[PDB]
Design an enzyme around this catalytic site. Structure first.
Site, mmCIF file in Angstrom:
data_model
loop_
_atom_site.group_PDB
_atom_site.id
_atom_site.type_symbol
_atom_site.label_atom_id
_atom_site.label_comp_id
_atom_site.label_asym_id
_atom_site.label_seq_id
_atom_site.Cartn_x
_atom_site.Cartn_y
_atom_site.Cartn_z
ATOM 1 N N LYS B 174 -5.593 -47.521 -6.369
ATOM 2 C CA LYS B 174 -5.511 -45.940 -6.075
ATOM 3 C C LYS B 174 -4.344 -45.830 -4.620
ATOM 4 C CE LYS B 174 -7.437 -42.638 -3.960
ATOM 5 N NZ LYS B 174 -5.990 -42.157 -3.905
ATOM 6 N N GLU B 247 -7.783 -51.093 7.942
ATOM 7 C CA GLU B 247 -7.040 -50.617 8.601
ATOM 8 C C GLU B 247 -6.817 -49.852 8.945
ATOM 9 O OE1 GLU B 247 -4.132 -49.725 9.828
ATOM 10 O OE2 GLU B 247 -2.236 -51.347 8.597
ATOM 11 N N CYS B 281 0.264 -49.988 11.796
ATOM 12 C CA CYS B 281 0.272 -50.890 12.530
ATOM 13 C C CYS B 281 1.723 -50.554 13.302
ATOM 14 C CB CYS B 281 0.486 -52.404 12.266
ATOM 15 S SG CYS B 281 -1.364 -52.916 11.944
ATOM 16 N N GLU B 373 -5.247 -38.745 18.244
ATOM 17 C CA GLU B 373 -4.226 -39.045 17.356
ATOM 18 C C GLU B 373 -3.575 -38.404 16.673
ATOM 19 O OE1 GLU B 373 -7.823 -37.983 13.972
ATOM 20 O OE2 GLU B 373 -6.183 -39.185 12.783
#
Ligand SMILES: NC(=O)c1ccc[n+]([C@@H]2O[C@H](COP(=O)([O-])OP(=O)(O)OC[C@H]3O[C@@H](n4cnc5c(N)ncnc54)[C@H](O)[C@@H]3O)[C@@H](O)[C@H]2O)c1
Ligand SMILES: NC(=O)c1ccc[n+]([C@@H]2O[C@H](COP(=O)([O-])OP(=O)(O)OC[C@H]3O[C@@H](n4cnc5c(N)ncnc54)[C@H](O)[C@@H]3O)[C@@H](O)[C@H]2O)c1
Lengths: 751, 751
Positions: B174, B247, B281, B373
């Site tokens: 998805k 991840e 990453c 974040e």
């Protein structure tokens, strides 16, 4: 106060005159010769010159012991561990005995030689433990004949015996005639370690005994020593099916850039002067200093050389010991006497078998001293302007063993290392050694690797053996002329070429039908192919991704002609060719798969940093294909070789050459760069010796016979050789990758 | 002139309103929602919110196709290659569609996203080709449910689909609800590539559809996205036996030393500002600059930020595109609005869905902005004085994904890299990616690796399955008192300790004989064990050689008590224990063997230098041992774990604890450093959730059941978890080494 030798003298008095260690027991002393302490001139012991009967008995005992020894890897690990514990328990005895016998300073023997020997056995115990499950496709070779030199007697023994034993082999090892004693003490601890009788055999003697071992009924010969003896061993073992490894010395270049840590570079070099003797992996003897720092580097070096203490090797403060033997002292004096180039500096020297640290500077890059073997505690130096010139000077010898590069810049150091022709490159260090880190040579420094997982393959063979197919005579026919143009050519340097000799032979099918003509290649064609491969040196610096793309194209373009190739094979052989074509396609796609996936190995070491055991191309490979499998044999050998970055010249199937000549179009359609794949057709009796002898080829693979001629001729430049077995029906891809690569271990800083 | 979108609009017009790609065919459009070009506000297409029935059908089709797909690895390689060729042939279409759908500059889509997607499929084709012979102990997992975010839509798809397919799995994937289009075009090329019907299934929708896939009858879930959703997925899959990779982002620190190449470091950072968005990453968002160069670095950075061109993403000269969605624009604006720390610099910005490059400097290391974040094209920066302080600041977050280190000194760069908590460290570069080079997280950045040989294991399972032994009830007995002192304790921090709770249970043999008493551990004991493991952090920085020596001692010292341990096992179980003791000794010697032999892997990459896929310890591991194999179960789990440099706390066999308590003396006699091995006895119902939840443990291995509780509780800090199968009679050593290590890929210059 110097180190006490009382315990060593007591052991020598107990052992008396020595015989050999054979079948777990000491034999009677025979034809005796002295081993003399070079520092004092005193005879340490009498040891025996082994007879042919002795060598026969040693090999017989090793053979008798080997199958039970091979059976239980866990049990071998326990014995290897016990040997390491006994080296550690008796470390002081081994160290003093090494100093007495060889002349080296006791501080080197205690700090370097014995600890590295211990670690070699500790580390290799684990390979025995893991062999059955982690190397399940491999089995022991059998009996190993091993011959080593005088410079690092115990450590050279460890480098030979530990991997051989770990992989389930037994050994007959001969130490150097000048330095037998630590090998005899190693023999004397084998019983205590639980070594089963005959698993380790030690015989003493000079080169004549070495020759007996090399030609004995052993499965492998492993040799460290002079290049000339290496050539003789390669000749003496040619065509016998023996495995062979050769570590042939060649003292390494030591590259000091303008931005090097000067004082660390100087101290590393001065601390290497005594070490860099004989045929050991080392660097420092050929000093290459960038011109901006050369005068300051040399001035600091000479004064640091002055601080080296020369004298009694039993004194733990001594840095420069006694020369190993008067013959070696004379060799160094003669070398210096024969040189007229440069400026010679020598520190003071005491009387006797001592030679002083010596620096010969101001040499030109082309000077003979920069290219000849260097003996003794002697450094020779030249300057360079650019890093590219340093690489050129460093690589301008017949050797390729170890090298050292000094620079504080993260880029420069790691940029220069892969460009140096060497099996080992140390960054900002020299003479760094560990049991996990493989070492060994290229060019005339030899072949094979010792240490690490990488060193084990040469002590093993496939668990299930393959057998090369029998030769096949070409079919004959009536000989009526051909009104059509069906004469195939050669493929050299990206284009078809007429054979230099002008001749072609008729090719017939199984019932005598003329199929066409195939060229008969000669030595001039091979020369042209080698030149084409030299022009294609850029291929060996391509990315794996690029090489994979090319191989994928070859596979696709063969597949597009699959029916045609099958029909050609059936025309030539009478048997359906579809399965052979499908297998050939599969080999190409397996080689394409591997081109960017055959990884180097990172070694944790108990020293500074990490050792990177990189995979590199061998270079230029000459390949002779079997008669059978007219397409699959050629493709199976070509594809893994070029996937690994080699350039190749293949002699196609002598009996059935027309599948290979149809393949020229596939190479062209697939954009294979000129000179990366070259194909010769014709008689392998014309080609085998020229290919094996050629001094500009890095390896010869002879899979159509002529093994003795090929292996003997390969001694000219000591190229690697492989003469099979090779069964094209078998998928050899993984094994061929190993034939097609060299290991280069780069030692880098790492937190 | 901007890039033409005519072909992309034509494809969107052809596909009309989208359904799903299921079973090789397009389904009817359903409950539609718009995907909007963020740069223009125009609706690009309507796509369907998948139903539960759709997800059921997708998984059913993937399951139906999987066994035939798994059968022929060579055939899968051809399909993966064909997919790569179609990505290359349609590269311009994929790139424009990505820019239209996501907002990123077309130059990034054309130069970065699409070429890396091509290379991922080209490279992974070869793994399919080699799987059968190079991974013979492995088999496909089955059906993979895959869920990816909006930042790199096509490349995230490639990172998921290529390895899954290579290893013989089928997929239900998805894409993100904001960026469905390149996944739908990928679906649309599957037929042309020869993807068999149902091998690839693409369903669209928001997180509710993601939830359906995660809980469907799939064998593996692979997720890239937010940490919070990662936790929910770990909870939703707990106890199901599904394989899981996560991840989870976490934008990486960018360490600039005083001796860095300043201008290259500045240019690398400015060129990363647009890239470093979402859960990818990357490194650059957290800037750490040494104080001596900080003012000059910042001044140069702000002016280079000014040179970034913001505007129409279809213009190939544009550097800063449109924000992916107004929700994301609001998220960035809100983040900046909530910050009061530091000095905020923003370049100019055009009107609409654009946010300017932003630098927030002058922050303290403890500032919340350095730890939360970061959203949008925003950098936050702080300074450091020493390299050790840089490491401390860099590692002071809950994340651990990628990092960048800039220094021209060969030592400093390679000294800092291993100290950073990260799955990837780039030296003198950032955001370097290649299909051969594994990437992934530690800590709350997740677990699992994508890329390279290393990424394949998570898409496979053992070819021959093991099964954990059934639980065994402890024997009961009459309960008469014990006049002798036979109450065993706990082993924590190098010494025996009383259980904090004070309780012990009687241990009886099979016929009711009282054998002794065993402590009942509690959460405070576990806390003390974790503290002991923290004090033993030095073990994780030891040499492999040192760890091997310790394990050899443990093996030797167990062997010296072998009869006694066999008698204890027979006392507890009624069955002879000699074979179990011999196996335990063997596991110790195998772990000793491996301690200095589990090598990292050097990746050739088509970029600058090489990627070193290093092996590192996981850290601190809590282990629950099975009832059966009272000694072998404990030793088999402990030994490979500590061989790899981990510290461990083991809950010994609940039914039969007294072999483990006899083992305390072996640990003491073998000089195992305090805190490296800690042993708890007692009820695993008391210990399983505390161990799985503990926020200071890096992994939990539960081999006695409680899998749902353990896997759910592990979401707290997203530690790695393993709940079996584990059969102590089977030698799992090699597999356990993988559970016991992390891969950290260090990108270094190399010629
Ligand atoms: O000269 P150097 O003494 O420095 O090195 P070297 O190469 O002559 O000798 C190294 C080792 O090879 C042995 N050896 C010498 N000639 C040999 C031969 N023909 N075949 C096999 N072994 C041989 C020597 O005895 C010694 O053990
Ligand atoms: O926030 P963001 O949009 O940046 O990242 P996100 O983590 O919310 O979403 C990343 C991906 O996960 C999917 N997703 C969202 N919630 C999910 C859930 N509970 N279970 C499974 N998949 C889920 C999203 O649709 C998207 O494909």
């Amino acid at each position: 106060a110097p180190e006490s030798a009382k315990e060593a003298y007591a052991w020598l008095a107990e052992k008396g005159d020595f015989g050999h260690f054979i079948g777990g027991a000491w034999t009677a002393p025979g034809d005796l010769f002295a081993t003399v302490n070079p520092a004092t001139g005193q005879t340490l012991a009498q040891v025996s010159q082994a007879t042919q009967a002795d060598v026969d008995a040693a090999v017989k005992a090793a053979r008798k012991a080997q199958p039970a020894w091979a059976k239980d890897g866990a049990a071998r690990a326990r014995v290897l561990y016990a040997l390491a514990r006994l080296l550690q328990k008796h470390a002081r005895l081994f160290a003093v005995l090494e100093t007495l016998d060889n002349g080296k300073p006791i501080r080197e023997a205690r700090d370097i030689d014995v600890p590295l020997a211990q670690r070699h056995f500790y580390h290799h115990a684990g390979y025995a433990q893991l062999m059955g499950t982690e190397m399940p496709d491999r089995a022991p070779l059998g009996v190993c004949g091993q011959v080593i030199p005088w410079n690092f007697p115990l450590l050279m023994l460890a480098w030979k015996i530990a991997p051989a034993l770990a992989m389930g082999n037994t050994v007959v090892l001969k130490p150097a005639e000048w330095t037998p004693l630590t090998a005899l003490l190693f023999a004397d601890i084998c019983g205590q370690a639980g070594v089963p009788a005959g698993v380790v055999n030690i015989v003493t003697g000079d080169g004549a005994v070495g020759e007996m071992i090399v030609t004995a009924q052993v499965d492998k010969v492993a040799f460290t020593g002079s290049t000339a003896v290496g050539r003789r061993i390669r000749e003496a073992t040619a065509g016998t099916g023996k495995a062979l490894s050769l570590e042939l010395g060649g003292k390494g270049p030591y590259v000091v850039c303008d931005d090097a840590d000067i004082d660390s570079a100087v101290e590393g070099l001065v601390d290497a002067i005594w070490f860099n003797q004989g045929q050991v992996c080392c660097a420092g003897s050929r000093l290459l200093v960038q011109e901006g720092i050369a005068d300051v580097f040399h001035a600091k070096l000479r004064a640091r050389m002055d601080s080296l203490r020369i004298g009694d090797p039993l004194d733990k403060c001594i840095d420069i010991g006694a020369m190993v033997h008067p013959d070696q002292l004379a060799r160094v004096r003669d070398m210096v006497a024969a040189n007229t180039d440069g400026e010679v500096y020598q520190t003071a020297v005491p009387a006797g078998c001592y030679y002083p640290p010596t620096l010969i500077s101001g040499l030109a890059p082309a000077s003979p001293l920069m290219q000849q073997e260097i003996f003794g505690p002697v450094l020779v130096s030249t300057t360079f302007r650019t890093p590219a010139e340093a690489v050129e000077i460093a690589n301008n010898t017949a050797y390729g063993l170890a090298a050292s590069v000094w620079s504080e810049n993260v880029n420069l150091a790691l940029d220069l290392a892969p460009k140096l022709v060497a099996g080992i490159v140390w960054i900002n260090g020299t003479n760094m050694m560990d049991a996990a880190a493989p070492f060994g040579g290229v060019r005339e420094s030899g072949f094979g690797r010792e240490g690490g997982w990488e060193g084990l393959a040469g002590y093993t063979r496939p668990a299930i053996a393959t057998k090369s197919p029998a030769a096949v005579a070409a079919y004959t026919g009536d000989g009526a002329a051909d009104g059509l143009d069906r004469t195939a050519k050669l493929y050299i340097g990206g284009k078809q070429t007429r054979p230099d000799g002008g001749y072609s032979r008729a090719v017939y099918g199984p019932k005598g039908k003329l199929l066409g003509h195939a060229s008969l290649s000669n030595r001039k064609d091979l020369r042209n192919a080698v030149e084409a491969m030299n022009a294609a040196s850029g291929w060996s610096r391509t990315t794996g991704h690029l090489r994979a793309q090319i191989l994928y194209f070859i596979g696709e373009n063969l597949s597009a002609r699959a029916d045609e190739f099958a029909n050609r094979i059936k025309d030539m052989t009478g048997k359906d060719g579809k399965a052979e074509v499908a297998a050939s396609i599969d080999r190409l796609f397996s080689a394409a798969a591997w081109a960017d996936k055959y990884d180097g190995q990172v070694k944790g070491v108990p020293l500074r940093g990490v050792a990177l055991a990189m995979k590199e191309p061998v270079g230029k490979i000459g390949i002779l294909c079997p008669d059978a499998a007219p397409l699959l044999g050629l493709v199976s050998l070509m594809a893994p070789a070029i996937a690994m970055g080699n350039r190749v010249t293949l002699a196609a199937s002598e009996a059935f050459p027309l599948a290979a000549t149809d393949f020229y179009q596939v190479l062209d359609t697939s954009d294979v760069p000129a000179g990366v794949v070259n194909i010769l057709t014709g008689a392998h009796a014309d080609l085998a010796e020229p290919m094996a002898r050629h001094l500009d080829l890095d390896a010869v693979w002879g899979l159509s016979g002529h093994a003795q001629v090929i292996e003997a001729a390969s001694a000219g430049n000591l190229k690697r050789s492989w003469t099979g077995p090779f069964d094209p029906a078998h998928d050899h891809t993984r094994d061929i990758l190993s034939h097609a690569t060299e290991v280069k271990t780069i030692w880098v800083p790492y937190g």
